[PDB]
Amino acid sequence: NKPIKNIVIVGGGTAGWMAASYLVRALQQQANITLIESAAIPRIGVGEATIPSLQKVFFDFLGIPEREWMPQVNGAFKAAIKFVNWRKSPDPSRDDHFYHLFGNVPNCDGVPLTHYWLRKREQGFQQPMEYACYPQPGALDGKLAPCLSDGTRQMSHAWHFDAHLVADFLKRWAVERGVNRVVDEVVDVRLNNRGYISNLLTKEGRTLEADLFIDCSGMRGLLINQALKEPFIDMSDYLLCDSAVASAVPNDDARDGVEPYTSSIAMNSGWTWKIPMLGRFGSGYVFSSHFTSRDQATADFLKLWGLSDNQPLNQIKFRVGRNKRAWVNNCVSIGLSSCFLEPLESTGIYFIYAALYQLVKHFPDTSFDPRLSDAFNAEIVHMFDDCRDFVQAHYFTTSRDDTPFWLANRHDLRLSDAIKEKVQRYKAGLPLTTTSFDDSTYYETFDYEFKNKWLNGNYYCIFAGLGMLPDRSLPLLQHRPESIEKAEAMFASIRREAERLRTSLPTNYDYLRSLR
Amino acid sequence: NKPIKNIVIVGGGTAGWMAASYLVRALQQQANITLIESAAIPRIGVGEATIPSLQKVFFDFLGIPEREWMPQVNGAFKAAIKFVNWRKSPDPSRDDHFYHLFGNVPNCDGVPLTHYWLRKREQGFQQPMEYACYPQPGALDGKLAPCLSDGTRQMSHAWHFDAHLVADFLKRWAVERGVNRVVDEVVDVRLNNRGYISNLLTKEGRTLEADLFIDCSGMRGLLINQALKEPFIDMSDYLLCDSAVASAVPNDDARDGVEPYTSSIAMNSGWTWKIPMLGRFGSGYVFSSHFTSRDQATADFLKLWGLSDNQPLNQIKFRVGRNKRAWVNNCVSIGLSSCFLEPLESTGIYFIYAALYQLVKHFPDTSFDPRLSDAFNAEIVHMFDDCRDFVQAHYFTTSRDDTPFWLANRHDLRLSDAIKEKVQRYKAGLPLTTTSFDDSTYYETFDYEFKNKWLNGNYYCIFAGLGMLPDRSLPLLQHRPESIEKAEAMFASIRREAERLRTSLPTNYDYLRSLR
Ligand SMILES: Cc1cc2nc3c(=O)[nH]c(=O)nc-3n(C[C@H](O)[C@H](O)[C@H](O)COP(=O)(O)OP(=O)(O)OC[C@H]3O[C@@H](n4cnc5c(N)ncnc54)[C@H](O)[C@@H]3O)c2cc1C
Ligand SMILES: Cc1cc2nc3c(=O)[nH]c(=O)nc-3n(C[C@H](O)[C@H](O)[C@H](O)COP(=O)(O)OP(=O)(O)OC[C@H]3O[C@@H](n4cnc5c(N)ncnc54)[C@H](O)[C@@H]3O)c2cc1C
Ligand SMILES: [Cl-]
Ligand SMILES: [Cl-]
């Protein structure tokens, strides 16, 4: 079969230029890549939070080190997500916060530290799980950097940045390496009688043709949804939020510092993200239109940060779910054109480079073997649905009942058999999927991580944080006092590391300043 | 809940004493373990072949190094399985053999060497896959040891031994560490109205009681099948063989050497195993009674090795399949009481210590939370069904059509959706599950291996060996000539290692002799 030689990418957002960059890197020879993007249709970039695999899977593949791209996007460091007022109904006299931290939890004789902690709590141990099982939460409370002053890594971390800038960065990178950039707007898509994309008709009268089309046109799904009629699976029965009111809020970093984490502040009919950068933090009230009006949500958002009625706002709406098939005929959907999930766990950009990773792993020729796209589509389904369930697990697990929104999350959600099964195992006291701690190649081979994205530690951070604990500790531990004693030594070690971090880490602000 | 304190194991075979050994090791405190075995009911031990996880998962857990247990069981080294006359109808003028080797296949720019080999074959490359992608097949042809004379490991390996002796070894090991051994025969099992095992009535009038019962009574399933009425899922529609005629055959190792591998010699209505040890090799014609009589199979077996009509034979029969649930109420089935699969891929003893591993991971208290057994049962189902599909893939893939037996395997088998999906992906040219080569922690964390037992390399050895190749090479490779060039360097390196092994390895016989 003849190889794919001409590729057309529709879209100049984060998805489009990640696709252009990744493909021009992966396809070293025999690859003509063209990207068309409309100047009259804006890109989505609200100030985004990410996860560590952005470096390992995407930028490492491009050969771009962290020190190269991060200052070009005015990046800040992210070491966790802090959930505020998610556990109980808001009480100004109560400190309601917990962290979902990056990194793996140590194992002790084949059992994660989370389970040794639970047994301790049964006997009266008061300290919260993540403060016992991780070394960095207290450091995050102190708004400290994830690295020493000399740049030595001290904890797993990701990044906060304006996605507009990473698109510009990748634009310059990809164009320099041969990607043809076209500023124009597609107005019509022509299919043959078979149903394959023949050509694209633009606004300036250009006719674009290719062997392979990549749809990065955003939520509208110009190619995959509108032209190819691939149905979008609405999953509003799984998750309730469908809107957002967002803006940027100035921050006096000199006296307030820069929080080295994303915040998720539970509201009456949703939650508000806080994504710190230098000089400001991006913020957005994600809400359900069925429980609050955009007007009311706007008022709550302004009141939360004490913003004025003159503050410019980014009014957003979206549909939760995914296409039935991400790849149909000769068109691959990447980004918002493929799927969407509320930014509760920073999975948006992850969906992009994870899908691109899978596209190269299933790269077609001009014959377009349906076995390739079928396999690709199955991977996308697994990827999205797994993250959807993890996010949903934040909702039906909550104890809040103060508003109709939270009551609905507790009782009226549709749950997959998969997430029901995990929760059942968790409640039984069983550890979920764990990996080796004294190895960490889980982060080095993406096939492993892609198929097992969320581990025991991730779920425990969420569940224990929301106050939903297993019925009992592992029955096995009653037979292994030596293992229990060994776990105590590990807890003590974590406590010592936390104390060392407190006096060794520079503030996140000072470290970000040293990088200018 | 009160902890499990009294445990009764029924059975003194390989399963029973592995269970006794593993549990007395895992349950350091609060564990009274009793094993009852009948002296009038023999154990099954035909001379068994194993896989490397026996050391990593079982003996390492007991703290017993290879050098300790192997000479106690008169063990020989196994480095692969050689399949003879499986590809085509037997032709004495043709050499029909291929190896299924232990170990992982190297990756080159995210693609296994198997796929770079396939592309080469498309362009005329003649050398068989496993001889190109592995360094040791030629060494195995030369009957060389898997280690240097000084004991330095040179290739991944497992073991051949009489399972009777490993049972005796573990018996002595477990009894010395507190396991109570009872020589008697259970004649009646009493259940309460709930359906839980109350007590065991023996032949000498003893009444045995416990919190937890382990059924290692063999194929009869004294507790799980007969008492608890748990249905056995007959899978004769998946696999056709149901019988075996076996014996031991003397070998002049001084002039013939000792083959460092198990052989699988395809017959008219089944296949014959060859499991070499010092001084002899165990052998057994596995056959389907629906295509040949035991009498005819016996004659073929004797004729194959030139044995006489006076040669004592072990006439065996079995049912292929598994219990619907491995663990019911307060009874856990381990070994032949749980499931059986023909020894095509040496999975029998694997099923034992893998299940025991899972039992400890799901260890109950006296309340017996059904969530624990449900989770355990699901793992057993995955374990068996996955190995069943892998074994079955040897059968429906063959090109042989010379007998009704092989025609039936080609056309009349029932295939799971899972195996159909894998074959489809393979035929499309896609790599199956792969792991990191420059790491090998896949063999260090059993959770990983248990869920992903058979990798791309394993399937490729079987499929390419049977002459069933993908329709085409990976389309991506047409865009990456640099990766192709890089793979050539790896092939050259493997060729050099093979040449070094040829002149460096002692013969398997001489090395086994040096260990006496
Ligand atoms: C409210 C919100 C919060 C988010 N938070 C996070 C987060 O915290 N972390 C994270 O990682 N991700 C997050 N995401 C996701 C992420 O921001 C976006 O998915 C990503 O940055 C851009 O996706 P996209 O490029 O596919 O869509 P878009 O940004 O909409 O890109 C659309 C592009 O296609 C072009 N185009 C469209 N139509 C046509 C046409 N007819 N002809 C020609 N050209 C055309 C447009 O000009 C534009 O260039 C969030 C998304 C939203 C909506
Ligand atoms: C033909 C064949 C080939 C095989 N090849 C391989 C191979 O190559 N590699 C591999 O790893 N595995 C292989 N296996 C599997 C392996 O040999 C056996 O599964 C294992 O060695 C023994 O299994 P078991 O102990 O559960 O059953 P058994 O050996 O039958 O043990 C039964 C025990 O339960 C006791 N018992 C029974 N009944 C009663 C009662 N009413 N009261 C009291 N006590 C009782 C018996 O006395 C006996 O001790 C093979 C099996 C077969 C049949
Ligand atoms: Cl997101
Ligand atoms: Cl076996």
Numbering used by the authors:
A (entry chain A), B (entry chain A): 2 to 517
Paper lines:
Flavin-dependent halogenases require an associated reductase to reduce FAD to FADH2, which is then oxidised by the halogenase and O2 to give C4a-hydroperoxyflavin (FAD-OOH). With PrnA, the carboxylic acid and the amino group of the Trp substrate are engaged in a series of hydrogen bonds to tyrosine (Y443 and Y444), glutamate (E450) and phenylalanine (F454) residues; the indole moiety is stacked between aromatic amino acids (H101, F103 and W455), with an hydrogen bond between the indole NH and a backbone carbonyl group (E346).
In light of this, we sought to engineer PrnA to improve its activity and regioselectivity with anthranilic acid through structure-guided mutagenesis. It seems unlikely that anthranilic acid could contact PrnA active site residues Y443, Y444, E450 and F454, as tryptophan does, while remaining proximal to the catalytic side chains of K79 and E346. Consequently, a series of PrnA mutants were produced with selected active site residues mutated to lysine or arginine. It was reasoned that the additional basic amino acid residues might make contact with the carboxylate group of anthranilic acid to enable tighter substrate binding and effect the orientation of anthranilic acid relative to the catalytic active site residues, thus altering the regioselectivity of halogenation. On the other hand, mutation of F454 to lysine and arginine shifted the regioselectivity towards para, with increasing 5-chloroanthranilate (4a) produced (38% and 46% respectively), while also increasing relative activity by 4-fold in the case of F454K compared to the wild-type PrnA. Following further mutagenesis PrnA double mutant (E450K/F454K) was found to display a 16-fold increase in activity compared to the wild-type, producing predominantly the para chlorinated product (4a, 54%). In order to rationalise the effects of the selected mutations on the activity of PrnA, X-ray crystal structures for F454K and E450K were determined at 2.4 and 2.3 Å respectively. Electron density for all active site residues is present and it is evident that K454 is orientated towards the substrate binding site and the catalytic residues K79 and E346. Attempts to obtain a structure of F454K with anthranilic acid bound were unsuccessful most likely due to low binding affinity of the substrate.
